[PDB]
Amino acid sequence: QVQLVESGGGLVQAGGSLRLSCAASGFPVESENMHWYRQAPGKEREWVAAIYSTGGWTLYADSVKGRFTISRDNAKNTVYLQMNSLKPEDTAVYYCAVQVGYWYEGQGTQVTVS
């Protein structure tokens, strides 16, 4: 069955670094443009990261521009997502989402910065 598995979540201190990993089964990594969303208490869920096909062409939100890293393991159809210079306000639940048809929502992981 097609499913998305996310790992690497945990507790990190202020100014630390983290490496989340989202792996997909049943379809290749280059088939669709991966998306990364975050949800925090407040208004509603918000989008943080997205990389499209035909080259990298990385796009980041203004609040998170220049501080996150995204890499692709094409041989193992996985996406690695690196947090650097985290702040306590960055605490949230993270989702990795892809499209092969109807919208697919991952379980996500909770990240808190102290």
Next chain:
Amino acid sequence: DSFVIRGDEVRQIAPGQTGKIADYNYKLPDDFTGCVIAWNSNNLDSKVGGNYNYLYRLFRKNLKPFERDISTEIYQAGTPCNGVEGFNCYFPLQSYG
């Protein structure tokens, strides 16, 4: 020609109609014959938390009618950055969200 745009962009999709997106993405010729069929897709193209799968050109250097520009090379508006993100140059693609 099938595509997805925003609300006010419907007016810009017309022959002889000016506009930033119409002049940068898709323009109809002055002697255009034919037409546009636009329908709302709030239940299909809109997702909670923001849908960022639709892109449009923002910065570019003219464009002929019925011309396709798949290349998204960086645009220099003035010391050249030499294809590096920073000052005097910005990414030409923006997401509707």
